[PDB]
Task: inverse folding
C-alpha cells in the first residue's frame, strides 16, 4: 500500500507522453501480467476461504492468520502525541540543581513544552540543559553519575519571568532516561520540593521500539541472550496463534450450513457470535 | 485531492441532439414493448 | 373470573381498612391469563359489544398496517447483506447490517405481531359471545328440529377456533414435517418402498427438502433418502447420478464463483450417509 503515489505518477506520465504502438503494447502487457499473477495468488491462498467467508459476517481490519508476519502491514505510520511526563514516569530522583527521570520504555521525543507555576521573584532559572540516554537501568541512583552516561540534547536560555518555554528538538531523539539541569540562576534532595517555583513538563512523543546500544563485548553477549529469549517467546506465541485455525474452520463449516436455530444483540446466530469472538477477540490479540 | 488521476463539458447544439436522440430511443423502446403484447 | 368475593358464613373485619385482629388471611390461585369478555344478557349490552368490536377492529387495522410497513426495510437490508461487502471497524464487531436485520425483525416485527395476535384473540372472543347470544335469542323467539350429536357440534360455537389459515408458512412447514415422518415410517416396508420410489420421491426429496427446515429435519430427510435406496440398484444409481451431476456442474464454475464449491455440503453429507450404511 506504499505505492499509491508511484502508480499515480506512472499512470499520469503514460497518459501524457505520446508513444509508439510497441511501447503501448509492452506497457499494457506488463500491467495485465501483474494483475493476472496477483489474481492467481489470491484465489489459491491457503487462508483465502477463511477470509472470504469472514468478510461478509464480521468487521475486521487486518489478516491475523499469516504464517510470516509482514513488516509492511505490521508497521503503520504512528503519529506524534502530547504526553505528560508524569504519566510515563516510573522512578525519579532529585538533587540540589538537577532532576533525573526514567520512563516506562523508549520514546521518540520531538518537542518539550515546560510550564512554570507559583513562581517567586527570589530566584528563577536562566539556562536549562536537557540530557537523554537510551540505556535501561533498574535504579535511578545507579544512573545518577553525571559525566559518562549522558548526551547533550539542548541548552535553552530564558528571559526573566518566563512561564512557558518551547524546547524544540531539530532531530527527534530516542530516549529512555532523561535529565534536566539548571545551569544558571533550589530543590529538596530527599523529596524534590521546590519553594521558588513549580515545574511541569510536556512531551511531543510517540512510542518507539528500540534497544540499548552495543559498545563492547559483554553487551554483545547480553544482546545475543536477549534475542534468544525473544525468539523463544515469539515461537511460543506463534504456535499459540496457529492453534486457532482448526476451530475457525469448524465454525465456518457449521455456519455454512445455516440451519435455523430457535432461541436484539443476543438474537444473532450463536455460531456467528462465536466466529466473531474467536477471530476479532483472540486471534487479534 | 493531490492525486492526479482522479481529475481525469458539452455545448448546446449537441445537447439538443442528445435530447432528441433520447426521445427517439424512448419511442423505439415503447413500440418494442407494445410489439410483445399483441394478440396471438 | 374478573371479580371475586369471599364470605365468612359460619363463625371481624374493619369496614374502612379491613384489618382483622382475630387472624390474618393470605390467598393463592392456580390460574393463567385468559382472553374473555363480558357476557350479553339484553340489548344495550349487545350495542356495547358491537361498539367495542368496532373499536378493536380499528385498532387491529392500524397495528396491521404498521406491521406490514416493515417489509420494504427488511428487503433493503436483505439486499445489502447479500452483497457481503467487507467493512472496516466482540459482540459489536459483527457486521452492522446483520445487527440491523436482527433489530428490525426480532425487535419490532415481533412486538407488532404480538400486539396483533392479542387484539385478534380479543376480537374472536367478542364475536363468539355475540354469536352465541344471537343464537340463544333466535331460539327463544322460535320456541314461542332435532339435531344429531355431530350436527350440534357443527352448528354450535364448539367447532369454531381450530382451523389454520390457508396461506400460512409455519403450518405448511409443519405439514411437511409430518409428511417426512410418515414417509419414513412407510418406507420400512420393502413393497411400499418400491412403490414410493416408483412415484418419483427421490428427486422431489433431493430438489426440495434437502436444504429446507431445521437441522433435525434435514438429517431425517437424508436418512429417508438413504433408506429409499436400501437394496435397489436402480434407485441407488438415480441418487448417485443426481449427486454426481450437481457436483460436476458446481465444480465447473467453482473457479469463477466459490459459493458453488461451498454449497455442496448436503450432497456430500448424503453420499457419506449412504456409504456408511452397509
Ligand atoms: Zn399457522
Result:
Amino acid at each position: 500500500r506504499k505505492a499509491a503515489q508511484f502508480v499515480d505518477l506512472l499512470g499520469y506520465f503514460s497518459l501524457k507522453t505520446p508513444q509508439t504502438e510497441k511501447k503501448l503494447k509492452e506497457y499494457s502487457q506488463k500491467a495485465v501480467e501483474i494483475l493476472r499473477t496477483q489474481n492467481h495468488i489470491l484465489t489459491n491462498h491457503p487462508n483465502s476461504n477463511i477470509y472470504n467467508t469472514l468478510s461478509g459476517l464480521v468487521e475486521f481490519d487486518g489478516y491475523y492468520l499469516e504464517s510470516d508476519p509482514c513488516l509492511v502491514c505490521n508497521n503503520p505510520e504512528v503519529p506524534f502525541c502530547y504526553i505528560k511526563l508524569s504519566s510515563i514516569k516510573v522512578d525519579t530522583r532529585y538533587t540540589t540543581t538537577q532532576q533525573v527521570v526514567k520512563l516506562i520504555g523508549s520514546h521518540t521525543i520531538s518537542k518539550v513544552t515546560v510550564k512554570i507555576g507559583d513562581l517567586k521573584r527570589t530566584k528563577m532559572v536562566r539556562t536549562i540543559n536537557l540530557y537523554y540516554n537510551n540505556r535501561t537501568v533498574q535504579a535511578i541512583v545507579e544512573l545518577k553519575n553525571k559525566p559518562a552516561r549522558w548526551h547533550k540534547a539542548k541548552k535553552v536560555q530564558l528571559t526573566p519571568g518566563q512561564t512557558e518555554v518551547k524546547i524544540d528538538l531539530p532531530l527527534p531523539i530516542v530516549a529512555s532516561n532523561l535529565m534536566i539541569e539548571f545551569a544558571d540562576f533550589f530543590l529538596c534532595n530527599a523529596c524534590g520540593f521546590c519553594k521558588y517555583a513549580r515545574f511541569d513538563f510536556m512531551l511531543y512523543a510517540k512510542p518507539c521500539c528500540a534497544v540499548d546500544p552495543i559498545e563492547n563485548e559483554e553487551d554483545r553477549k547480553k544482546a545475543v541472550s536477549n534475542i534468544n529469549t525473544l525468539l523463544d517467546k515469539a515461537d511460543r506465541v506463534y504456535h499459540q496463534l496457529m492453534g486457532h485455525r482448526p476451530q475457525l474452520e469448524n465454525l465456518l463449516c457449521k455456519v455454512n450450513e445455516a440451519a435455523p436455530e430457535k432461541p436484539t444483540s443476543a438474537s444473532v446466530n450463536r455460531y456467528i457470535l462465536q466466529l466473531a469472538q474467536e477471530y476479532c477477540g483472540d486471534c487479534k490479540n | 485531492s493531490q492525486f492526479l488521476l482522479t481529475r481525469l463539458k458539452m455545448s448546446e447544439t449537441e445537447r439538443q441532439s442528445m435530447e432528441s436522440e433520447r426521445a427517439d430511443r424512448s419511442l423505439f423502446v415503447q413500440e418494442l414493448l407494445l410489439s410483445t403484447l399483441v394478440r396471438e | 373470573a374478573s371479580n371475586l368475593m369471599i364470605e365468612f358464613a359460619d363463625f371481624f373485619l374493619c369496614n374502612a381498612c379491613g384489618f382483622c385482629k382475630y387472624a390474618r388471611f393470605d390467598f393463592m390461585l392456580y390460574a393463567k391469563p385468559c382472553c374473555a369478555v363480558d357476557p350479553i344478557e339484553n340489548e344495550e349490552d349487545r350495542k356495547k359489544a358491537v361498539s367495542n368490536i368496532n373499536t378493536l377492529l380499528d385498532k387491529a387495522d392500524r397495528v396491521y398496517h404498521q406491521l406490514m410497513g416493515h417489509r420494504p426495510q427488511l428487503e433493503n437490508l436483505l439486499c445489502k447483506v447479500n452483497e457481503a461487502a467487507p467493512e472496516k471497524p466482540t459482540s459489536a464487531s459483527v457486521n452492522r447490517y446483520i445487527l440491523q436485520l436482527a433489530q428490525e425483525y426480532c425487535g419490532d416485527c415481533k412486538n407488532s405481531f404480538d400486539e396483533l395476535s392479542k387484539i385478534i384473540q380479543k376480537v374472536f372472543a367478542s364475536r363468539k359471545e355475540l354469536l352465541e347470544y344471537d343464537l340463544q335469542q333466535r331460539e327463544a323467539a322460535t320456541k314461542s328440529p332435532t339435531f344429531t350429536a355431530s350436527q350440534y357440534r357443527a352448528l354450535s360455537v364448539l367447532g369454531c377456533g381450530h382451523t389454520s389459515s390457508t396461506k400460512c408458512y409455519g403450518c405448511a412447514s409443519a405439514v411437511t414435517e409430518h409428511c417426512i415422518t410418515l414417509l419414513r415410517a412407510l418406507a420400512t416396508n420393502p413393497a411400499l418402498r418400491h412403490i414410493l420410489v416408483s412415484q418419483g420421491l427421490i428427486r422431489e426429496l433431493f430438489d426440495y427438502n434437502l436444504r429446507r427446515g431445521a437441522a433435525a429435519m434435514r438429517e431425517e430427510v437424508r436418512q429417508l433418502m438413504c433408506l429409499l435406496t436400501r437394496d435397489n440398484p436402480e434407485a441407488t444409481q438415480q441418487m448417485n447420478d443426481l449427486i454426481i451431476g450437481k457436483v460436476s456442474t458446481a465444480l465447473k464454475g467453482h473457479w469463477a464463483n466459490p459459493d458453488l464449491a461451498s454449497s455442496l455440503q448436503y450432497e456430500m453429507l448424503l453420499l457419506t450417509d449412504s456409504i456408511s450404511k452397509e
User: Anything to note?
Assistant: Chain A touches chain B through six residues (CB under 8 Å). The pocket of zinc ion is lined by residues C 164-165, 168, 170-171 (CB under 6 Å).
